[PDB]
């Protein structure tokens, strides 16, 4: 008779996504117990803005989004409203309006390999900043100077994204941190997502 929103798929997925192509999962028609989230001792950051996770086990929202991706430790600061840097501006931007939670944890035992795990990637350039909750998976060669490169890389013309070098001996912060971001939707629409208490 179970019918809970599947947060087990979001947090316990064996492989995650690179931040430039961050995975979004929707939450609809279900009842989710949020006490499983905050009360499991494997989270290094659980910043909630404008909402408390211990106090919405009552209210029903229109729908909940769970964005999940993988960055490095020093970049978890950028997953916040009003931040700047290569991740907040070119990879995953949060609005200043943000109401939700950015949950993150150290994953050096899953997303590391001896010779480096280059499977996670981040965007270095684009000609403009990301709108909030925008996902740009473009691979167009970034034109850095006056020279226009018609699809061929060369001088002042680089590939727009590079890959992390996650080797397990790197100091903390050059280590992979998995991140899950919960955004909340509710006002003038049927609500199908809430909790028990």
């Amino acid at each position: 008779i179970t019918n809970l929103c599947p947060f087990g798929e979001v947090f316990n997925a064996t492989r995650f996504a690179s931040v430039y192509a961050w995975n979004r999962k929707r939450i609809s028609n279900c009842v989710a117990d949020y006490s499983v989230l905050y009360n499991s001792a494997s989270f290094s950051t659980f910043k909630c803005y404008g909402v408390s996770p211990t106090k919405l086990n009552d209210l029903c929202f229109t729908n909940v989004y769970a964005d999940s991706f993988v960055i490095r430790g020093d970049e978890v600061r950028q997953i916040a409203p009003g931040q700047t840097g290569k991740i907040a501006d070119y990879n995953y931007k949060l609005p200043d309006d943000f109401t939700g939670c950015v949950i993150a944890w150290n994953s050096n035992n899953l997303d590391s390999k001896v010779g480096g795990n280059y499977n996670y990637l981040y965007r270095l350039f684009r000609k403009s900043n990301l709108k909030p909750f925008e996902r740009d998976i473009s691979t167009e060669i970034y034109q850095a100077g006056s020279t226009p490169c018609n699809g061929v890389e060369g001088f002042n013309c680089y590939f727009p994204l590079q890959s992390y070098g996650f080797q397990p001996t790197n100091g903390v912060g050059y280590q992979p941190y998995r991140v899950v971001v919960l955004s909340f939707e509710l006002l003038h629409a049927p609500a199908t997502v809430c909790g028990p208490k």
Partner: nanobody
Amino acid sequence: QVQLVESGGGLMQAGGSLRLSCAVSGRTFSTAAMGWFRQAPGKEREFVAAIRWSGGSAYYADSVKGRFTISRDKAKNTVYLQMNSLKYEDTAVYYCARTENVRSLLSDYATWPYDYWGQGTQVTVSS
């Protein structure tokens, strides 16, 4: 496991053409770039050409610019090296290499290490 297989080596007299193939099996969507290396007996391995899997822009060692053309077919996961105007300079064992390290700068693939290698095929120029 990922394994690369080289093809198309052999004997051919100078001035002629040769096309080598290197077929890849396994972890395919993780391919960042492929490259070709060669090694004559007693002399050290040298880069000749690399190609990015996404986009396909190529980087060439100066020694084969205008003579060698590196090519790739994503659908059947083979990288090619077209070797025209062969010289006796070009006789060596030619290795293809595969990396999953996506590097923003294309010339990185001339110096950075490659994770997986084939076992090579011999190209002999007869002058």
